[PDB]
Amino acid sequence: VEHPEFLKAGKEPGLQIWRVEKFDLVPVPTNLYGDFFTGDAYVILKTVQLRNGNLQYDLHYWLGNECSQDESGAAAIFTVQLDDYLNGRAVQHREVQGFESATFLGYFKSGLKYKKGGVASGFKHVVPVVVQRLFQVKGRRVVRATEVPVSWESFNNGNCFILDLGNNIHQWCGSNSNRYERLKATQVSKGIRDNERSGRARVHVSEEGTEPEAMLQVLGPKPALPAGTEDAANRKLAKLYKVSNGTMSVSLVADENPFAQGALKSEDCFILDHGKDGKIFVWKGKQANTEERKAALKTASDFITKMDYPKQTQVSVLPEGGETPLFKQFFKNWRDPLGLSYLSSHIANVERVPFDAATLHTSTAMAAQHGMDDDGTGQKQIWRIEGSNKVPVDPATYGQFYGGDSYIILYNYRHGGRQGQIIYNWQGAQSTQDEVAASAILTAQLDEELGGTPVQSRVVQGKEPAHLMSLFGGKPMIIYKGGTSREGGQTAPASTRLFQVRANSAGATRAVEVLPKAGALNSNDAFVLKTPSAAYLWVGTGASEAEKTGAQELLRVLRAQPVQVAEGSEPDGFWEALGGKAAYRTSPRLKDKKMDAHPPRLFACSNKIGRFVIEEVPGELMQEDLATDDVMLLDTWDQVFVWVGKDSQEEEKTEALTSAKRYIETDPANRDRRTPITVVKQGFEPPSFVGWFLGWDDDYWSVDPLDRAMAELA
């Protein structure tokens, strides 16, 4: 019962595509994965192996434009029944032509092809040739190739076109076609030659005026052609509703912005309304009855109409305990009762390498996963911003940063065979705005006077990166909440102070001053309470040797002999110094699983017409997606790289630090405002950046990437 090919589905990790032909799944040939008839519906099952050996199922069903009404319903029916066959532990997606999700687009790096025809017209994927097709290649990072009529009417000056003739495959790009867009058109022309034609096809690329005689026979003379036509901040707001059942009825449960994990009741299903951005999630509760769970895919279509969203809205239904990290970031502190529920398919190929200082200079991957460009024991110079000039910090005070000051640290990192530099700009949260802006102005000039190659990294008091903690050898990075270290104003310390001693991957600690309240404690870290009478050394149950050894060295600065005290075993005088015992933070940290819960995503952005638009590039993070004439954002959880190309617009280069700020402000997860941003330039990327790019070639930009493939593939 209901097992035609379900047996073969989801048995091994990989990609599986079927075509719904007459209410039946017809497998698509492996060499033709990516071709999609505009008149049919498909069902795609991506099997990914979790870290714990189990399998993870991403169920996509794709709807063609010229697809019949019952063709799409048959695809949605198979998706509900395939998920039912796979124990319901699958994420289902409603993908439409030209508006599919990033998870689906990641499965096709060569690019999609939208072929004319379908089941009703009498067409099928076969390898029998003699053809005469023409594709329009649109998109810069998400490259789509829609079949168009074979005529100059379908051409334009802005895009590249591929005229298929069988024994010859002519590629043609207009006068206004961007060079990076021509590179993506070559991927499609190669995917046609090597896969569809089985390598027996001569590709002849050409441009305006230099078109061959073969093009002149099937198209004719070339007349005057027209030009091309080619997120904003709507991704900030989202809402959550509860569905009940006659007809359908939704009721608002979530106010706005982020929500709570407790509102998700297991007995019912919910809708994560984000249609303003273009996607709606449907959350199947574990106690939700069977009628509602199987009709959950239809509940989204009704909600699309009930709210008047476009038909091509992305839909993703998911079960309880199998939520995607995209969905989980809409919630305040998500907790699951190696690996987690979901595993992002684009980081599933990345091999996890734990930190080891002895081999850090060898593994670029280890540098990315921990943010350590090197061990942090290189030549460094530190300045303090007094007014409008840099003041060298006393070498004895190296490691002490006051909240009322702004600093500039120029560090020389060594890693692998190459050598580089990083410029840290530590903006204290209590520093005056004129000096804070001056620190950033001096940080930028220091870069341009150093050749424009070093790295810029704006860091705010509290959220210091992992690499910045380790710059002081064995000494911990001490952060004072206020005051200043200039000769003039020598501020006195507070009567009672509290220091949180956090440790990073490399075991280096940082002591950030916080408010002397019991709620500021954290069981994972060691804490120091400097009261006038005594001197405590709170060792959290989760604190290791690194936090303890770094906490007592902080007392060496305060000239107070510590009284080490255990968690939950503190004498009464400890609570009297804070202000009464309170419920602190006992929950542990993610550590190794923080990369899974928040996978690194790559975006392209543009601040044109006073509107900040961001386009996420799907699939595995590859070097070829970094466009030289663009400014890219790599969003790690602790850090936000901003890769700026060499051939980008002049305003885009300067408006790069603000571009990442706009990206963090508009993030629906309500990211920390103090999240550090790192400015990285093309050709001088630090190891913590290239470690996410497997197969990173150093001399990649030594030869033009277009001129490479224009001869490498032709």
Side-chain angles (χ1 to χ4, degrees), residues 1 4-229 232-714:
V1 162
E5 292 217 335
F6 284 14
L7 296 74
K8 303 193 157 210
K11 257 29 186 169
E12 275 173 341
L15 192 63
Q16 289 158 298
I17 306 183
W18 298 278
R19 180 169 132 184
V20 194
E21 302 184 15
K22 301 138 178 291
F23 200 15
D24 186 34
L25 294 171
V26 169
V28 178
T30 314
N31 73 93
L32 293 164
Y33 276 14
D35 288 335
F36 288 106
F37 274 101
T38 188
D40 298 330
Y42 294 78
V43 175
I44 299 90
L45 173 61
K46 173 51 171 278
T47 306
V48 185
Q49 185 170 328
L50 295 178
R51 289 210 64 191
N52 51 47
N54 305 339
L55 292 179
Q56 162 187 300
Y57 299 115
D58 290 314
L59 257 181
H60 303 257
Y61 74 103
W62 177 87
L63 310 184
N65 270 341
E66 280 57 62
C67 171
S68 91
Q69 246 291 347
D70 294 331
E71 266 273 10
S72 58
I77 281 169
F78 281 141
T79 306
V80 178
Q81 283 169 31
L82 240 189
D83 167 85
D84 199 349
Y85 174 80
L86 302 169
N87 294 17
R89 297 153 61 259
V91 182
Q92 317 174 37
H93 306 255
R94 178 188 175 275
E95 316 286 38
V96 284
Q97 177 171 343
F99 292 89
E100 41 271 78
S101 77
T103 314
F104 181 85
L105 292 158
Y107 308 149
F108 312 91
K109 294 273 92 182
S110 178
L112 294 177
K113 259 170 286 166
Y114 297 135
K115 291 142 64 69
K116 281 194 180 200
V119 172
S121 51
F123 292 128
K124 28 180 161 292
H125 304 283
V126 284
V127 195
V129 208
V130 174
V131 286
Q132 191 178 291
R133 309 180 300 174
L134 214 177
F135 301 91
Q136 176 177 6
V137 187
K138 215 92 177 64
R140 227 164 89 88
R141 32 205 50 88
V142 278
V143 45
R144 295 177 171 93
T146 313
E147 183 171 6
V148 292
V150 185
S151 189
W152 289 113
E153 305 287 337
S154 308
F155 278 85
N156 68 87
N157 292 138
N159 306 124
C160 293
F161 291 83
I162 298 174
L163 178 85
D164 195 342
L165 256 52
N167 200 250
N168 302 308
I169 300 176
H170 295 258
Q171 180 168 324
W172 187 97
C173 296
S175 167
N176 297 323
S177 59
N178 169 245
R179 297 184 58 88
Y180 180 79
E181 300 171 14
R182 309 175 206 168
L183 174 139
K184 294 283 176 160
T186 316
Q187 296 177 341
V188 180
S189 182
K190 187 194 183 179
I192 294 181
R193 176 197 62 174
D194 298 340
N195 310 332
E196 202 159 347
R197 217 59 33 78
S198 194
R200 303 182 300 106
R202 304 175 65 92
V203 177
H204 305 276
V205 64
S206 50
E207 313 207 327
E208 295 212 31
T210 74
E211 41 272 3
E213 185 179 68
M215 279 186 57
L216 268 46
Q217 271 194 350
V218 306
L219 294 163
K222 169 185 179 293
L225 317 94
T229 322
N234 294 334
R235 58 184 272 271
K236 178 54 190 296
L237 261 290
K239 300 180 181 180
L240 181 148
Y241 301 81
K242 163 179 171 178
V243 305
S244 198
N245 176 40
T247 70
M248 194 273 308
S249 73
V250 288
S251 48
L252 185 53
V253 179
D255 320 283
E256 265 161 22
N257 216 2
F259 329 116
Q261 195 179 13
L264 264 49
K265 312 299 178 176
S266 301
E267 287 72 40
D268 320 85
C269 304
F270 301 88
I271 299 180
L272 204 291
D273 181 22
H274 202 203
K276 50 223 75 175
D277 199 42
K279 56 221 62 181
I280 51 175
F281 303 86
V282 188
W283 185 86
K284 299 189 304 172
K286 62 175 181 177
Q287 259 66 84
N289 73 114
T290 310
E291 300 194 83
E292 185 57 55
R293 266 211 305 275
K294 310 209 77 59
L297 206 60
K298 183 175 215 299
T299 308
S301 292
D302 307 341
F303 184 81
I304 281 178
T305 305
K306 189 75 178 184
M307 297 286 286
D308 197 31
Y309 287 120
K311 166 170 290 189
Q312 44 272 97
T313 301
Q314 294 178 5
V315 183
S316 292
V317 318
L318 56 87
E320 178 174 339
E323 307 86 336
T324 63
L326 308 142
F327 173 87
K328 294 187 291 188
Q329 287 176 14
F330 288 94
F331 295 77
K332 295 163 184 163
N333 302 342
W334 186 282
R335 306 298 188 191
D336 312 82
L338 253 174
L340 280 171
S341 311
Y342 195 80
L343 170 59
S344 203
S345 182
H346 76 280
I347 68 165
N349 292 276
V350 174
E351 191 185 35
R352 321 297 209 265
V353 49
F355 182 81
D356 176 41
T359 44
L360 177 56
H361 51 91
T362 313
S363 172
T364 58
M366 181 189 302
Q369 307 206 13
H370 303 286
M372 307 289 301
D373 287 308
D374 67 327
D375 48 23
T377 53
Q379 305 237 272
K380 65 176 192 293
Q381 172 71 52
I382 307 180
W383 293 282
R384 179 180 60 257
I385 305 305
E386 294 186 21
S388 51
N389 264 308
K390 296 165 296 176
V391 171
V393 185
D394 181 21
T397 52
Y398 269 19
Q400 285 160 281
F401 300 93
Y402 287 82
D405 282 321
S406 297
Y407 302 84
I408 290 181
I409 301 99
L410 173 60
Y411 180 79
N412 299 9
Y413 73 86
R414 92 203 88 83
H415 184 281
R418 208 240 297 175
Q419 191 270 337
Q421 285 175 338
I422 305 173
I423 314 173
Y424 288 93
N425 176 227
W426 194 87
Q427 298 177 11
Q430 212 182 260
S431 177
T432 56
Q433 258 291 343
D434 67 318
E435 298 189 337
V436 169
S439 70
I441 292 177
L442 291 155
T443 307
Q445 288 185 336
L446 182 61
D447 193 73
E448 293 299 323
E449 71 182 38
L450 261 58
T453 72
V455 186
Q456 293 114 307
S457 170
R458 191 214 86 268
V459 47
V460 188
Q461 174 177 13
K463 253 288 178 293
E464 296 85 5
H467 185 14
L468 184 56
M469 304 182 232
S470 308
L471 289 193
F472 313 100
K475 300 159 181 55
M477 184 184 177
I478 301 170
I479 288 89
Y480 304 107
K481 201 200 180 195
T484 174
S485 47
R486 51 196 65 195
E487 172 180 329
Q490 205 288 329
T491 68
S495 56
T496 307
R497 316 165 82 180
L498 215 180
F499 293 83
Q500 172 174 352
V501 188
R502 216 162 184 168
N504 79 113
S505 310
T509 43
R510 71 176 206 260
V512 178
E513 190 172 357
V514 297
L515 294 79
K517 271 91 174 189
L521 292 177
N522 195 279
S523 299
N524 299 114
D525 303 320
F527 285 72
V528 172
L529 183 58
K530 176 70 200 82
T531 173
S533 59
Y536 303 101
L537 198 84
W538 199 69
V539 45
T541 49
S544 64
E545 172 72 5
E547 277 99 323
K548 292 176 297 184
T549 187
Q552 66 185 2
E553 193 152 289
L554 167 65
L555 275 307
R556 197 165 305 163
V557 178
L558 309 184
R559 314 107 182 271
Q561 200 71 35
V563 188
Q564 190 165 344
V565 68
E567 174 166 352
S569 314
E570 320 89 350
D572 49 283
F574 179 82
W575 297 118
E576 270 84 76
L578 292 169
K581 194 182 187 306
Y584 45 95
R585 283 68 171 78
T586 315
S587 311
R589 306 257 177 77
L590 299 124
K591 279 189 299 299
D592 262 8
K593 295 168 176 174
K594 197 169 73 180
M595 191 193 78
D596 289 26
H598 312 90
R601 306 199 157 275
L602 188 66
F603 305 81
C605 61
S606 176
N607 233 318
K608 185 54 206 305
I609 321 172
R611 304 176 204 281
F612 190 49
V613 55
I614 50 164
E615 174 170 31
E616 182 182 317
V617 48
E620 291 206 72
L621 271 49
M622 300 182 306
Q623 181 173 35
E624 297 87 314
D625 289 290
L626 265 48
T628 62
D629 61 341
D630 210 338
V631 174
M632 313 295 288
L633 308 177
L634 197 161
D635 185 26
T636 325
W637 195 240
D638 314 78
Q639 198 174 206
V640 180
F641 293 101
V642 46
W643 184 93
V644 50
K646 193 263 297 182
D647 300 311
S648 47
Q649 289 163 26
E650 174 61 56
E651 320 90 74
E652 293 277 86
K653 291 193 181 71
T654 64
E655 305 293 292
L657 210 160
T658 48
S659 293
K661 287 190 172 183
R662 282 173 168 265
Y663 167 80
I664 298 171
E665 292 170 14
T666 53
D667 195 306
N670 278 247
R671 302 279 291 278
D672 189 21
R673 49 212 61 90
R674 315 165 307 174
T675 298
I677 302 172
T678 293
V679 181
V680 170
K681 288 162 173 207
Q682 171 184 317
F684 307 99
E685 301 83 345
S688 55
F689 182 85
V690 310
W692 303 108
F693 298 81
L694 203 148
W696 177 275
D697 187 26
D698 295 310
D699 41 36
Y700 175 85
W701 291 291
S702 59
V703 60
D704 193 286
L706 175 64
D707 303 346
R708 183 196 315 278
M710 209 85 274
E712 184 156 66
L713 309 188

